Amino acid sequence: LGPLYAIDAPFAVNLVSQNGRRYLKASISLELSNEKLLNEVKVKDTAIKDTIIEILSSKSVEEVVTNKGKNKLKDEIKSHLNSFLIDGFIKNVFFTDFIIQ
Numbered sequence: 586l587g588p589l590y591a592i593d594a595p596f597a598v599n600l601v602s603q604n605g606r607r608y609l610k611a612s613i614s615l616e617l618s619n620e621k622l623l624n625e626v627k628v629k630d631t632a633i634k635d636t637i638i639e640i641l642s643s644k645s646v647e648e649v650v651t652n653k654g655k656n657k658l659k660d661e662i663k664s665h666l667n668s669f670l671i672d673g674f675i676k677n678v679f680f681t682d683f684i685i686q
Contacts, residue, residue: 586616587616587617587618587619587620587676588616588617588619588620588622588623589614589615589616589617590614590615590617590623590626590627591612591613591614591681592612592613592614592615592630592633592634592637594634595610595611595612595682596609596610596611596612596613596634596637596638596641597609597610597611598611598638598641598642599642600641600642600644600645600646600649600685601642601643601644601645602645602646604646607646607685607686608685608686609641609642609644609649609683609684609685610682610683610684610685610686611641611680611682611683611684612680612681612682612683613637613662613678613679613680613681614678614679614680614681615663615666615675615677615678615679616675616676616677616678616679617673617675617676618673618674618675618676619672619673621672621673622670622672622673622674624672625670625671625672625673626670629669629670632669633666636662636665636666637662637666640658640661640662640665641658644658646685649685650685655680655683659677659678659679659680660678662675662678663675663676663677663678
């Protein structure tokens with residue numbers, strides 16, 4: 586395992602839904618490939634939240650309720666975030682809390 590970076594503020598977004606108004610509450614942690622990436626993912630904290638909000642809020646309930654959905658989601662998050670990081674890459678995305686209200 587490499588350095589863990591908890592995005593302390595949980596994410597709360599709307600999900601795309603036919604049935605009225607549905608929400609996602611979700612706490613995210615990133616596994617960093619090396620220790621130097623720590624400093625960069627703090628400096629770029631704001632862009633990471635923005636990217637994640639845009640990705641999360643583009644999903645329907647059906648696209649995130651299964652475990653295949655959540656894993657596609659974790660891959661979309663990690664590969665967009667990696668596109669603008671240069672001192673390393675996110676190896677993994679973990680949810681420490683994930684609920685649809």
